[PDB]
């Protein structure tokens, strides 16, 4: 639940970036 034209949206924005941050960090697992 995010309210339009409010502060909350901006906060939400921050979160999403850090999310994809991990998507370009973790590459471990079974090495070739």
């Amino acid at each position: 639940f995010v309210s339009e034209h409010t502060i909350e949206s901006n906060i939400l924005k921050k979160a999403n970036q850090k999310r994809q941050l991990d998507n370009v960090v973790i590459q471990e697992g079974d090495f070739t």
Partner: protein, 108 residues
């Protein structure tokens, strides 16, 4: 004196051609470079968003009126009353203590 004159009689300075690649963009850098409005400190980004929303939606006048009435104004009034009665209680305490002290000094 010949070497100094020869060095000072140069071929001017034609190598630069007025280089100025960015460093720094005037307003695009401040507003978006890159994401998250560099040094946004969301309060003022919220300021821009709220001002744009209230202007476009045309809610300015009733908001101004109700804030002229205000909600925090009642809080300020209540805190003023609290400070007033606290000061009155402090004055009563001080005067009673002074009376007790003067009575004790008179007794002894």
């Amino acid at each position: 004196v010949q070497l100094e004159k020869a060095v000072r009689t140069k071929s001017n300075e034609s190598r630069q051609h007025l280089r100025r690649p960015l460093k720094r963009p005037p307003l695009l850098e401040q507003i978006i470079s890159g994401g998250l409005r560099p040094k946004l400190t969301t309060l003022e980004k919220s300021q821009l968003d709220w001002a744009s929303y209230v202007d476009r939606a045309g809610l300015n006048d009733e908001l101004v009126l109700h804030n002229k009435d205000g909600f925090l104004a009642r809080q300020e009034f209540l805190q003023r009353v609290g400070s007033a009665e606290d000061e009155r209680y402090k004055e009563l305490r001080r005067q009673q203590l002074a009376q007790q002290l003067q009575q004790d000094s008179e007794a002894s």
